[PDB]
């Protein structure tokens, strides 16, 4: 006989649920291990007892009929362990507050249990009827905790019920609303899916329902989370109940394993193809990781962390193929035995809450303000799959799909990178101690940010083969601490690039043409391709303030240079004006450069000092060019307003320099030509030689216009004594073909050492400079009543005494016939 001897009984009927242990649609055939074989099928959490006065007009849909036989009914009163044929029921009503409070009130011993089949719970916050049917066996809105072969051991240590539960299987949680866009966890075997301590809801652990649920699931096997549409669709469903559509606990969620297959996809949600960010990103078979720490209340007053660790995880990222394929970090650092590893940290702060030192502190302050985040510490990863492209793929993905991923959480965020060794695979990575930075909306105002970069590298290494191996020589290298203060209203790209290449050698011109430089400018050149949403590409405009401090250049290759050494100190290309335009003001304010020449023109050159004797040093050269491609309308007005050019030399030195130069449109300089101290010492000056070539005179006036051409000295004499060719000595004032002279009171005072000592200097020149080829009407006057004291022999013998030629329209010269025109007629005086 089917003795029905059970019904609703006295119990703590919760606000949201009615405590009524009903055995419905079951033949309760009851026929200190006291067993009464029964059928408790039909226990129903119809619930809805609080709303609308029990909501009698609309009973809740969540209800269970035939929810497990539980026939065995093992053990009796005394650790009341029960071996059952019923797994559990599902309170489809809110599993955050109402169900938690009901459970806490009901619990208010160390009983165990052993269920059969792991009911498919569907707590959403007739699906709960499906959960009850699965208890009989035991697109979206399909949250399911169904261990097919339930190994649940309900520890249920009620002694404030400090409960516990260890299982050997796992659920499959498509967590979605109340396109396969939710997680698809498939942990299944005990280590393979070691589900542990799922719920507490007890005031003993925490003091929602004071869980303190340390669900520190420690599995060690595949447990593949095959698909994960978003991280954010995870914070909302955890803080709020749920706000998706068709489209005082401290949850410490720990997870450590050697192997757990996984997929990570970014969060790009409408509320706050697929998501743009990091297309096809997989941390495949990496360490389990993805350990979280959350809270029931929205807008967590305490911050939310999300850590990660991996030794050499083979995470195929953005896969074609990974841009970085292994953490590959064998980087011992400390005095003790250490093995550095990677990590991807996240630190979210509630919305509306409350350069070694400049770049660090600025982005530390930017990290103290969080509306999103991202962080990496890669010791020696530097990795890239054999199929990878830093030049192209990294640009196409990790720069476009980087910040346009709906950055907001409860868009002031931060970003850091840190590498002790780097490899830019395809090529001179040279990377040691480098970083990358990014900010958005500094201090809250859009348009303010701090982009930075640091490293310490070897300057120039070539590619396909062999490295150039430059930099054989406490600011760091490539300290590209650019500044951006763009305006959304203007909607234009502004850059304040405070570049600093300290003591580098930034040359890439390997072959005779700029071949490896061509490679560098075909790889590196890409101006922030930004087709992402919310950024229609702003028109590019650049304003550089670069500082190539101490960027020595001594290996500039050509057909046959001779170990050429040019030791610049400061190359301050402070282009305060926009470069990408017709006009470009470029104040090259250099500081005391120099030059040194090697042994012999044929490429091989050795000497005692490769930092050899000085040849042509400059005190300062403020070449403030304003190229119009001083109000000079003419195109390319290279007004190199140079300050001065000191030159020191010996006959061999300048001869070798001339061999080096031989073998290897207004231009108004007003530039002092030489305070030349030029073994011999013989001062020569040429002050304010305004060689404004092509200034006008109609075609290349090219006026020497030499304001002073005093040949200070020659021969062995270094002291100034007035030799000649305010003064305005336009010796070469030209046209299209003319010449002149300044009529100085005394021009040729030749009585010092040997007037033919410069002749033997010319002989030593032709001995050094092996090839010496040059061995309207002009009116090429000498135009000076010469106060004199072989022409040199007669000058020496005589040492007023001569007269000016006044060769009006003589045209005796023809570029090679100057001597012929000088030989016209005869003259002598005194």
């Amino acid at each position: 006989d089917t003795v029905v001897r059970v019904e609703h009984s006295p119990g703590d009927g919760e606000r949201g649920v009615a405590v009524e242990v009903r055995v419905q649609r079951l033949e309760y055939c009851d026929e200190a291990f006291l067993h009464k074989l029964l059928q408790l099928a039909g226990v129903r959490l119809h619930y809805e007892e609080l709303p609308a006065q029990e909501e009698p007009p609309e009973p809740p849909l969540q209800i269970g009929s035939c929810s497990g036989y539980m026939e065995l009914m093992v053990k009796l009163k005394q650790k009341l362990e029960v071996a059952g044929q019923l797994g559990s029921l599902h309170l489809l009503l809110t599993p955050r507050q109402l169900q938690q409070l009901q459970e806490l009130l009901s619990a208010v011993d160390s009983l165990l249990k052993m269920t059969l089949g792991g009911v498919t719970l569907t707590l959403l916050q007739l699906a709960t009827h499906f959960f009850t049917e699965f208890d009989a066996t035991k697109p979206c809105s399909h949250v399911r905790l169904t261990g097919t072969a339930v190994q649940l051991s309900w520890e249920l240590r009620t002694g404030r019920r400090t409960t516990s539960m260890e299982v050997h299987f796992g659920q499959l949680e498509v967590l979605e609303c109340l396109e396969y866009t939710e997680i698809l966890t498939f942990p299944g075997t005990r280590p393979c899916a070691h589900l542990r301590h799922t719920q507490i809801l007890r005031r003993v652990p925490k003091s929602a329902c004071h869980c303190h649920s340390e669900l520190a699931l420690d599995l060690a096997n595949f447990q593949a989370d095959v698909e994960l549409g978003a991280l954010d669709r995870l914070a909302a469903l955890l803080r709020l109940a749920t706000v998706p559509a068709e489209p005082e606990q401290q949850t410490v969620f720990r997870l450590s394993a050697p192997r757990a297959t996984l997929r990570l996809r970014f969060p790009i949600a409408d509320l706050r193809g697929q998501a743009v960010r990091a297309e096809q990103l997989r941390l495949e078979l990496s360490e389990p990781q993805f350990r979280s720490e959350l809270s029931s209340g929205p807008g967590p007053p305490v911050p939310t962390h999300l850590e990660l660790t991996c030794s050499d995880l083979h995470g195929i990222y953005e896969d074609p193929v990974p841009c970085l394929r292994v953490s590959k970090a064998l980087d011992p650092k400390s005095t003790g035995r250490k093995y550095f590893l990677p990590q991807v940290v996240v630190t979210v702060n509630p919305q509306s809450s409350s350069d070694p030192e400049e770049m660090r502190t600025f982005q530390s302050r930017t990290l103290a303000l969080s509306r999103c985040s991202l962080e990496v510490i890669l010791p020696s990863v530097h990795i890239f799959l054999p199929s990878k492209e830093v030049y192209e793929s990294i640009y196409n993905r990790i720069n476009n799909d980087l910040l346009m991923w709906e950055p907001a959480d409860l868009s002031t965020f931060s970003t850091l990178v840190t590498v002790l060794k780097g490899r830019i695979t395809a090529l001179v990575l040279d990377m040691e101690h480098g970083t990358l930075f990014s900010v958005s909306q500094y201090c809250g105002q859009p348009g303010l940010g701090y982009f930075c970069l640091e490293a310490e590298k070897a300057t120039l290494y070539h590619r396909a083969q062999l490295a150039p191996t430059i930099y054989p020589s406490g600011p760091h290298m490539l300290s590209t601490a650019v500044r951006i203060h763009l305006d959304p209203h203007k909607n234009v790209k502004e850059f304040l690039v405070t570049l600093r290449l300290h003591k580098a050698t930034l040359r890439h011109y390997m072959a005779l043409p700029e071949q490896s430089w061509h490679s560098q400018l075909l790889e590196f050149l890409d101006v922030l391709d930004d087709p992402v949403l919310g950024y229609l590409p702003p028109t590019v405009i650049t304003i550089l303030h670069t500082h190539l401090f101490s960027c020595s250049v001594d290996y500039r290759p050509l057909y046959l240079p001779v170990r050429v050494l040019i030791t610049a100190e400061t190359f301050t290309l402070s282009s305060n004006i926009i470069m990408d335009t017709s006009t470009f003001l470029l104040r090259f304010i250099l500081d005391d450069s120099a030059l040194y020449l090697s042994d012999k023109c044929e490429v091989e050159t050795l000497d005692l000092r490769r930092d050899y004797v000085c040849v042509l040093d400059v005190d300062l050269l403020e070449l403030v060019i304003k190229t119009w491609k001083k109000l000079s309308q003419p195109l390319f007005e290279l007004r190199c307003s140079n300050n001065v050019v000191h030159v020191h030399s010996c006959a061999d030195s300048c001869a070798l320099l001339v061999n080096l130069l031989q073998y290897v449109s207004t231009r108004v300089v007003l530039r002092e030509v030489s305070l030349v101290w030029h073994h011999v010492l013989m001062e020569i000056q040429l002050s304010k030689v305004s060689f404004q070539h092509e200034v006008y005179r109609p075609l290349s006036r090219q006026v020497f216009i030499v304001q002073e051409l005093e040949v200070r000295d020659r021969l062995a004499s270094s002291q100034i004594n007035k030799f000649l060719y305010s003064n305005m000595l336009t010796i070469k004032a030209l046209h299209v073909c003319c010449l002149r002279v300044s009529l100085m009171p005394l021009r040729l005072n030749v009585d010092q050492d040997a007037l033919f000592f410069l002749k033997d200097f010319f002989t030593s020149l032709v001995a050094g400079i092996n090839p010496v080829v040059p061995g309207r009407e002009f009116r090429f006057t000498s135009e000076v009543p010469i106060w004199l004291d072989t022409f040199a022999g007669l000058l020496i013998g005589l040492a007023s005494e001569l007269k000016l030629k006044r060769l009006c329209c003589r045209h005796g010269l023809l570029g090679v016939d100057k001597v012929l025109g000088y030989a016209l007629n005869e003259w002598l005086q005194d």
Partner: protein, 360 residues
Amino acid sequence: MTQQPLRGVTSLRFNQDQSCFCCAMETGVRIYNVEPLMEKGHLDHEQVGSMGLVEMLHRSNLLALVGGGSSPKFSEISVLIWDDAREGKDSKEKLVLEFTFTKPVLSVRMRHDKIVIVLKNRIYVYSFPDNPRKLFEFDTRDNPKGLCDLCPSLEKQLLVFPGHKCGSLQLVDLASTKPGTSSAPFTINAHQSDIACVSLNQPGTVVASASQKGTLIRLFDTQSKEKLVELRRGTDPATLYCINFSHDSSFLCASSDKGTVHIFALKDTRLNRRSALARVGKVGPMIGQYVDSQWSLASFTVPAESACICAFGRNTSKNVNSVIAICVDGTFHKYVFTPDGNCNREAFDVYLDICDDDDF
């Protein structure tokens, strides 16, 4: 009202022997041979700017230049010496000397050994060309036309200018004057009104002068100071522009604002016309000065609105003499005249339209 210079001509001067003339202009300087009429060279606006005065030293390469007109490169208070024979690529190399003053230069006069600079109330005399030093300085009455003449003779160093008394001349022998001493200028009471023109003959034996009335030209012996002759240009007042002697002192020419050049015989004064009243013998005590006046032998007409300088040409034959007039309107006029008083145009040209024949 400064009359705008007709065709840009600011001043005209014959050289010391009347064989060349120089033309200062708004466009620079031009130099002409008189017979045949031919340009001998110019200085353009790019070399010298607009010019107020030019004086040539004889037939040499030496020019004295004073800036003036609408666009001068040089000051009106500076006399610049240009040497055209100097070879130089820059025009500045041909500028060999500068004399700077505290007031505008109104005239320059040169001879082989001296340069004379005339200001409104002062005349300076320097040695020239070699190592120029100030020899003399003379105070004058108001001399707003820079009136001065300097004897070109090697034998006589006579300077003449308006004296302190109205219508008087001061004459100074610069050879008899010790440098830095005032040899007292001797005074001739030539006229009763201000002097308008003054000229010396080539030997410096005779001085001619006219006043602002311009009816009479008076000649004086420079040694005795006696009045040699009184010539009558006309009944009516006229502004004289130029008076000059013939090379042999046989004749005198005079140009005026009447558009007429008058020619007088000085050696044979019987060739000069006399008033018909001089034939109606001495009827009464009051007509005496009109009866003794000598009228021009000959005269010819030039454009009346054009100021002109006049000089004698080279004697072409034993009895035919020529007179040239150079007018500020750019016109050249040559007339031949005979002792019977015939006067006929021999040539007429526009000397400003003479280009350098760069064709030969």
